[PDB]
Amino acid sequence: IVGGTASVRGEWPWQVTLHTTSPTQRHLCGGSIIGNQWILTAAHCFYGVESPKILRVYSGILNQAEIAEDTSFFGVQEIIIHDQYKMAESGYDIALLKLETTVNYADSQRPISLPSKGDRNVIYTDCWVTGWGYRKLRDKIQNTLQKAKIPLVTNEECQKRYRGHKITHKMICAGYREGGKDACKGDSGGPLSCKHNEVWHLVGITSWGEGCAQRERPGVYTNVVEYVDWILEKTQA
Numbered sequence: 001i002v003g004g005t006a007s008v009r010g011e012w013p014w015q016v017t018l019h020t021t022s023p024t025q026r027h028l029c030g031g032s033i034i035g036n037q038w039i040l041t042a043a044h045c046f047y048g049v050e051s052p053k054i055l056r057v058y059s060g061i062l063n064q065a066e067i068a069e070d071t072s073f074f075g076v077q078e079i080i081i082h083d084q085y086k087m088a089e090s091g092y093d094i095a096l097l098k099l100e101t102t103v104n105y106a107d108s109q110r111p112i113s114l115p116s117k118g119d120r121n122v123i124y125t126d127c128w129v130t131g132w133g134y135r136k137l138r139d140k141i142q143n144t145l146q147k148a149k150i151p152l153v154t155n156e157e158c159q160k161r162y163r164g165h166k167i168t169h170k171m172i173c174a175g176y177r178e179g180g181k182d183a184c185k186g187d188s189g190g191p192l193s194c195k196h197n198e199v200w201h202l203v204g205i206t207s208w209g210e211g212c213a214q215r216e217r218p219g220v221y222t223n224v225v226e227y228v229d230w231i232l233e234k235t236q237a
Contacts, residue, residue, distance in 0.1 A: 001131050002213035003181035004148030009062040012130050014112035014202070015145065015191060017064065018045065018097070019056040019073075027064060027141045030131040030190030031057065031097065032202050033111045038235055039097035041189035042205055042222070043081045044088040046095065052076035057099060060108030064132060064143050075100035080234050082227075088208040091170050094222050095189075096234050112191060112202045115225040124194035124203060127152055127174060129219065133186030137212055141186050148181045150174045152194075152203075153218050161216050170226040172204050175218030182219045184212035192221045 016039055020028045029045035039057055049055070055076040058067055080096040087093075103109060130147045134140065151174060158173035159165075167173065174192065175182055183190065183206045192204030204221030211217060 001129060001133055001142070001146035001148050001187055002135055002184050004129075004146040007062065007130060007145040007147045010060070010108050012145065012147070012193065013060070013108060013110045015130055016057050016059045017061050017067070017132060018189060019058065019067070020049070020054050021056060022054045025056070027132055027186065029188045030133070030186075030206060032191040032205070033059060033103060033109060034114060034202065034231070035111060035235060036102040036105070037099045039099065040202065040205065040224075040231070041095050041097060042088070042093050042207055043085040043095040044093050044207070045189045046079055046081065049079070052079045055079070055097070057097065059103060060106065062145055064141065074103065082230065089165060091168050093207045094205060094227055094230070096231070112193065112200055114228055114231065115196075115201045115203055117225065117228065119196065119201070120225055122196060124152055124196060124201070127192060127194040127203060129174065129183050129187070129190065129192055129206065131183060131187030131190040131206065133188070133190070134184035134212065136184065139184075150176070150181050150219070158218050158220070161218055162210070162220075167220070170223050171207070171220055172223040173218035173220050174204070177216060179213045179215040179217065182209065182213035
């Protein structure tokens with residue numbers, strides 16, 4: 001997260017840190033709890049991952065320092081990537097992680113509500129982007145969860161900032177015309193929380209961008225609402 005600040009513990013209870021144990025344990029991507037056994041994240045976050053066995057999901061985390069060999073975690077039973085996904089920049093950058101065990105909700109860890117179709121016209125009040133990603137180009141996973149308030153930009157506006165790319169309606173961007181605040185490497189898979197009527201909503205999933213926080217280069221996120229049907233179909237046994 002660029003241009004952000006340290007989050008308060010439990011402030012973003014749906015945020016999880018997805019780790020990989022190979023070769024050695026490290027943070028890989030961010031993710032969002034959306035069900036007792038389901039994490040919503042980015043598909044491009046599993047590039048080079050042949051097995052869910054090397055994945056570990058940690059919930060209720062503020063500082064990576066909290067994560068040690070004796071720290072409890074959720075094992076991943078299955079990785080579900082959207083069948084139309086090819087690459088972040090082309091869209092469909094969405095994936096479901098089915099945990100091996102259920103999450104016991106608490107103030108430190110709870111699910112975020114998915115947006116409803118009857119909310120695409122809703123002017124999201126305030127949207128916050130969060131993660132342990134890079135604070136700048138060529139940095140390193142940050143210890144304390146960072147947060148940053150970032151306004152959404154129209155698709156038409158985003159397209160202007162990404163000639164050469166096709167910003168579809170299944171994407172949504174956010175950022176300042178002047179840059180300064182944005183997601184960055186490591187925040188991928190993270191949630192783009194928006195406060196709809198004192199109620200949080202998982203509006204987007206951190207996906208991609210040209211550099212980080214550069215001027216006239218908004219962050220691009222998966223437009224979650226365009227996948228509520230997909231999510232329902234994939235989560236029903």
